Design an enzyme around this catalytic site. Structure first.
Site, PDB file in Angstrom:
ATOM      1  N   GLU A   1     -11.532   1.558 -10.478  1.00 20.62           N
ATOM      2  CA  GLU A   1     -12.795   1.810  -9.784  1.00 20.62           C
ATOM      3  C   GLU A   1     -13.951   2.012 -10.763  1.00 20.62           C
ATOM      4  OE1 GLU A   1     -12.105   4.928  -6.964  1.00 20.62           O
ATOM      5  OE2 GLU A   1     -11.151   3.532  -5.471  1.00 20.62           O
TER       6      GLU A   1
ATOM      7  N   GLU B   1      -4.614  -0.435  -4.441  1.00 22.07           N
ATOM      8  CA  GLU B   1      -4.630   0.975  -4.012  1.00 22.07           C
ATOM      9  C   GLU B   1      -5.030   1.198  -2.565  1.00 22.07           C
ATOM     10  OE1 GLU B   1      -6.190   4.119  -6.881  1.00 22.07           O
ATOM     11  OE2 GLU B   1      -7.069   4.892  -5.045  1.00 22.07           O
TER      12      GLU B   1
ATOM     13  N   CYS C   1      -4.722   4.625   0.576  1.00 20.59           N
ATOM     14  CA  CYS C   1      -4.095   5.816   1.160  1.00 20.59           C
ATOM     15  C   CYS C   1      -4.941   6.235   2.329  1.00 20.59           C
ATOM     16  CB  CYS C   1      -3.966   6.948   0.147  1.00 20.59           C
ATOM     17  SG  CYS C   1      -5.543   7.618  -0.468  1.00 20.59           S
TER      18      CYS C   1
ATOM     19  N   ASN D   1      -5.123  -8.583   4.878  1.00 22.08           N
ATOM     20  CA  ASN D   1      -5.169  -8.977   3.490  1.00 22.08           C
ATOM     21  C   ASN D   1      -4.367 -10.271   3.281  1.00 22.08           C
ATOM     22  OD1 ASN D   1      -6.423  -7.018   1.069  1.00 22.08           O
ATOM     23  ND2 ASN D   1      -6.054  -5.877   2.944  1.00 22.08           N
TER      24      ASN D   1
END
Ligand SMILES: *[C@@H]1O[C@H](CO)[C@@H](O[C@@H]2O[C@H](CO)[C@@H](O[C@H]3O[C@H](CO)[C@@H](O)[C@H](O)[C@@H]3O)[C@H](O)[C@H]2NC(C)=O)[C@H](O[C@@H]2O[C@@H](C)[C@@H](O)[C@@H](O)[C@@H]2O)[C@H]1NC(C)=O
Ligand SMILES: CCCCCCCC/N=C1\OC[C@@H]2[C@@H](O)[C@H](O)[C@@H](O)[C@H](O)N12
Length: 493
Positions: A231, A336, A338, A366
């Site tokens: 990030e 990533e 969550c 995706n």
């Protein structure tokens, strides 16, 4: 032997499966299909079979495979081995630890084949460290792995590889550099590397990546890929509360071109794939344009990593789809995710059906837009969603209850398993069209051996009868119950 789920409710929409030191839950013919089903009402990857029929008639919803429309090949699925995941897993008794890892990595479990590994500390650590904390060590002489790596992460990653039947790919990502390399002299806050790419700060930082790959190799672990930075956008943000390191896309372009790409190419680890971005998909296609139109950077970039957190701002067609159209040879990979990160969300909702459906809805979308893999965040957390040095608590597919030597498998675990168990590396996405508007999410893939797999998520509460047509083998007649998820497999032979 197939041991069934031990259901337990915690007041939310569905149950978790309870595992302990002695017990965890675990696991065609021709003209026949297999179905695996998970429902909110409690069914957990339950197997059933059905005939592939020759003819079909009716005006019901029909999903037709197009096995001649070939798209992306799949890299795989998995999760992150943070310090927090390691601490939680190591806090169980060794037999319970084996059942937890088998759950994820063994053929008796869901067959993860990717592990993300942070390079030094992030928010999911109990302390703040890098691998070269000695000030102004430009030589990286005092570079070393602390116990977090040598006693926690590495031995667990070994145990995982030992239990896997499928070969496992490791992926590495740094949050922050040594603070003496940073404009602001701290692990968090707004701040980037001092100076400019091509210089001593930047060559040092690049060298650290190699130093990291060297140290992991000494412990007999090798990496499939690294990302250029977790990030990068974070360190652009005033006040950023945890480990970060800011890059604009120009700065990332020039870092990869002048430092990180060359330094990796000139190393024993030249086969390691470099992935860029490792950030929100709203940054695409802009970031890919800035980085990949420079031939000096493009030649080092294997792929683009994305995180899911601002998906709501970024429709997949305009971001993922446009990136693939411009750069079809540079793979997209989800690295990533969550749930529970929003300030208003409760961190952990034990038994949340809704969170499980968020995972599968994301994987399907995706996959429908060219993405080659999908990686969860922390492999396991405690009931509070930690530990985490800044109390940035989130949810995880496995929750560990240390004082009871038990762990809970949440619906996220199964929604994930619906993909990871049945879509091996090398599988390839093929076309699938719907006869009419519908509330299902569905994707079809071809295994390397040519057999079919189709995953169907039902986002509505209504039971939807449907038919899957495979153009030269026949028809599957099935029902997709409200909120449920199904994986279908059949041999086309
Ligand atoms: C690890 O989890 C397992 C599985 O949940 C625990 O064992 C199970 O224990 C339950 C109840 O303790 C047992 O239950 C049934 O039969 C009763 C009488 O007919 C009935 O009234 C009750 O409601 C249950 O349906 C169930 O059969 C059993 N599961 C299996 C397949 O073993 C286990 O517990 C402990 O180790 C064994 C010896 C267990 O039977 C208990 O007596 C022990 O205390 C869990 N370990 C721990 C530490 O909790
Ligand atoms: C808004 C982003 N939300 C997050 O939710 C939690 C997760 C962080 O733990 C992770 O270190 C970051 O990469 C990422 O930002 N994360």
């Amino acid at each position: 032997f197939a041991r069934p789920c031990i259901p337990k409710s915690f007041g939310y929409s569905s149950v978790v499966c309870v595992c302990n030191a002695t017990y965890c839950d675990s696991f065609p013919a021709l003209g026949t299909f297999s179905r695996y089903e998970s429902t909110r009402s409690g069914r957990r990857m339950e197997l059933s079979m059905g005939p592939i029929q020759a003819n079909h008639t009716g005006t019901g919803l029909l999903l037709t495979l197009q096995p001649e429309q070939k798209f992306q090949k799949v890299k795989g699925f998995g999760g992150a081995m943070t310090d927090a995941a390691a601490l939680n897993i190591l806090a169980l008794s060794p037999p319970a630890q084996n059942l937890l890892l088998k759950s994820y990595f063994s053929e008796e479990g869901i067959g993860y084949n990717i592990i993300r590994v942070p390079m030094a500390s992030c928010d999911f650590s109990i302390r703040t460290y890098t691998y070269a904390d000695t000030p102004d060590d430009f030589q990286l002489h005092n570079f070393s792995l602390p116990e977090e790596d040598t006693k926690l992460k590495i031995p667990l990653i070994h145990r995982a590889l030992q239990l896997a039947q499928r070969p496992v790919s490791l992926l590495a990502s740094p949050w922050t550099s040594p603070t003496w390399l940073k404009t602001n002299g701290a692990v968090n806050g707004k701040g980037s590397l001092k100076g400019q790419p091509g210089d001593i700060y930047h060559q040092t930082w690049a060298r650290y990546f190699v130093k990291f790959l060297d140290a992991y190799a000494e412990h007999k672990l090798q990496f499939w890929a690294v990302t250029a930075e977790n990030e990068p956008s974070a360190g652009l943000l005033s006040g950023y509360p945890f480990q970060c390191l800011g890059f604009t896309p120009e700065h990332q372009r020039d870092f990869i071109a002048r430092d990180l790409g060359p330094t990796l190419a000139n190393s024993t680890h030249h086969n390691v794939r470099l992935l860029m971005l490792d950030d929100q998909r709203l940054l695409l296609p802009h970031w890919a344009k800035v980085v990949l139109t420079d031939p000096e950077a493009a030649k080092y970039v294997h792929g683009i990593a994305v995180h899911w957190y601002l998906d709501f701002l970024a429709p997949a067609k305009a971001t993922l789809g446009e990136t693939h159209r411009l750069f079809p040879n540079t793979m997209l990979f989800a690295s990533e995710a969550c749930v529970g990160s929003k300030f208003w969300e409760q961190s952990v909702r034990l038994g949340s059906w809704d969170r499980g459906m968020q995972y599968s809805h994301s994987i399907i979308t995706n996959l429908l837009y060219h993405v080659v893999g999908w990686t969860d965040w922390n492999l396991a957390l405690n009931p509070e969603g930690g530990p985490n040095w800044v109390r940035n608590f989130v949810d995880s597919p496995i929750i560990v209850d240390i004082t009871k030597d038990t762990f809970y498998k949440q619906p996220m675990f199964y929604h994930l398993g619906h993909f990871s168990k049945f879509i091996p590396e090398g599988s390839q996405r093929v076309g699938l069209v719907a006869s009419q508007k519908n509330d299902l999410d569905a994707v079809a893939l071809m295994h390397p051996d040519g057999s079919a797999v189709v995953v169907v998520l039902n986002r509505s509460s209504k039971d939807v009868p449907l038919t899957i047509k495979d153009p030269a083998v026949g028809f599957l007649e099935t029902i997709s119950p409200g909120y449920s998820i199904h994986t279908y497999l059949w041999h086309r032979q």
